[PDB]
Paper text:
Dual‐specificity tyrosine‐phosphorylation‐regulated kinase 1A (DYRK1A) was demonstrated as a promising therapeutic target for diabetes for its influence on pancreatic β‐cell mass and proliferation.
The equilibrium dissociation constant (K d) of DMB (compound 1, 5.11 ± 0.33 μM) with DYRK1A was much smaller than that of harmine (81.7 ± 12.8 μM), suggesting a strong binding. Enzymatic activities assay further confirmed that DMB strongly inhibited DYRK1A, with lower IC 50 values than harmine. DMB was bound with DYRK1A at the same binding pocket as harmine, adopted an extended conformation and occupied the whole flat‐shaped pocket. Hydrogen bonds were formed between 3‐hydroxyl and Leu241, also 8‐hydroxyl and Lys188. DMB (75 μM) increased the thermal stability of DYRK1A in intact cells.
Author numbering: 135 to 407, 412 to 480
């Protein structure tokens, strides 16, 4: 028996629908599970509203990580400006029967759920544009110097709708997040959304989030992951099928560059060693998006906001996001100036 019988064998609190907490919270049900513990829907009898409570595991490591998350949300929740309103709001935090608990505003489903309710056909380029603009604003919030927060784990599942009918979104789950100051694994981000500098074991900064955003937007419009690596080597190879071989001057300083590429005698780089990939740069984003053939699936011929001209703007913005060079990858302020948004 664990924690006087309240935990199970994974350090997870045993959620019992209906329980009341501190004479304040009525636990409704489980809505989420992860390596950190659980998320319940709960009714805050005092404020008279539903909340999402995140119940960290009763175990020292996860508690220390979650304490990082809390300081980072308390830092964000110190800032005036209304950019902060695309980050999920921390309502409070407390210890309960040995678990650190984070009370959040209650939201609706995440964008991977939204994709499944379309049967992975994707949402329209207009909906994607509105998601893009919210997300860049949210990254611009994180970049403000006092914060300089890497989320470190952007993907559809961590972008939630506010309300199932509107298109407002907030970013959740700052449990793997860090400030420019702090760090570390280099094994961060989910594989499909992992920046190349992370794969090559280079130093990363806030720019890695902007890579993940690039891949998320494309996936939201086509329905399928742009780069679905089944492991690090496959990941980098799927990237290279689209963006070609990464600049020499970056590979020249990439600790794990020889995990994927051979330096030819002459100093230029190529891929290594029977179904081959597609030649570098040959699966062109132009055909993935369907720029000239009715958007993904042909399904958008003649729709409004999906003229070839809108698709060229989109492709431009994504490529600027999928820059290999993290010092020239488009930054939040300038993604918002792009003609995709005007
Ligand atoms: O913060 C989270 C969260 C939230 O703030 C509101 C909500 O309606 C759901 C949520 O679901 C999560 C999850 O499944 C994993 C990790 C998280 O941090 C969250």
């Amino acid at each position: 028996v664990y924690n006087d019988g309240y935990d199970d064998d994974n350090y997870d609190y045993i959620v019992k629908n209906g329980e009341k907490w501190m004479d304040r919270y009525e636990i409704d049900s489980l809505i989420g599970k992860g390596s950190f513990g659980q998320v319940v829907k709960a009714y805050d009898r005092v404020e008279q509203e539903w909340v999402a409570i995140k119940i960290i595991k009763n175990k020292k490591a996860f508690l220390n990580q979650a304490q990082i998350e809390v300081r980072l949300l308390e830092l964000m929740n110190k800032h005036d400006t209304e950019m902060k309103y695309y980050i999920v709001h921390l309502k409070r935090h407390f210890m309960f029967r040995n678990h650190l608990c984070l009370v959040f505003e209650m939201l609706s489903y995440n964008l991977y759920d939204l994709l499944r309710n379309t049967n992975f056909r994707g949402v329209s380029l207009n909906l994607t544009r509105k998601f893009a603009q919210q997300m860049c604003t949210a990254l611009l919030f994180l970049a403000t110097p006092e914060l300089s927060i890497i989320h470190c784990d952007l993907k559809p599942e961590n972008i939630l709708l506010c309300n199932p009918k509107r298109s407002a979104i907030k970013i959740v789950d700052f449990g793997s997040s860090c400030q420019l100051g702090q760090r570390i694994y280099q094994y961060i981000q989910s594989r499909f959304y992992r920046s190349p500098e992370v794969l090559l074991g280079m130093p990363y900064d806030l720019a890695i989030d902007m890579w993940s955003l690039g891949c998320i937007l494309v996936e939201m419009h086509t329905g399928e992951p742009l780069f679905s690596g089944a492991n690090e080597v496959d990941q980098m190879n799927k990237i290279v099928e689209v963006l070609g071989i990464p600049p020499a001057h970056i590979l020249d300083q990439a600790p794990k560059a020889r995990k994927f590429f051979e330096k030819l005698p002459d100093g230029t780089w190529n891929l290594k060693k029977r179904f081959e990939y597609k030649p570098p740069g040959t699966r062109k984003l132009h055909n993935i998006l369907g720029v000239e053939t009715g958007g993904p699936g042909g399904r958008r011929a003649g729709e409004s906001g999906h003229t070839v001209a809108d698709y060229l703007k989109f492709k431009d913005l994504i490529l600027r996001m999928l820059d290999y060079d993290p010092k020239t990858r488009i930054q939040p302020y300038y993604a918002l100036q792009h003609s995709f948004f005007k």
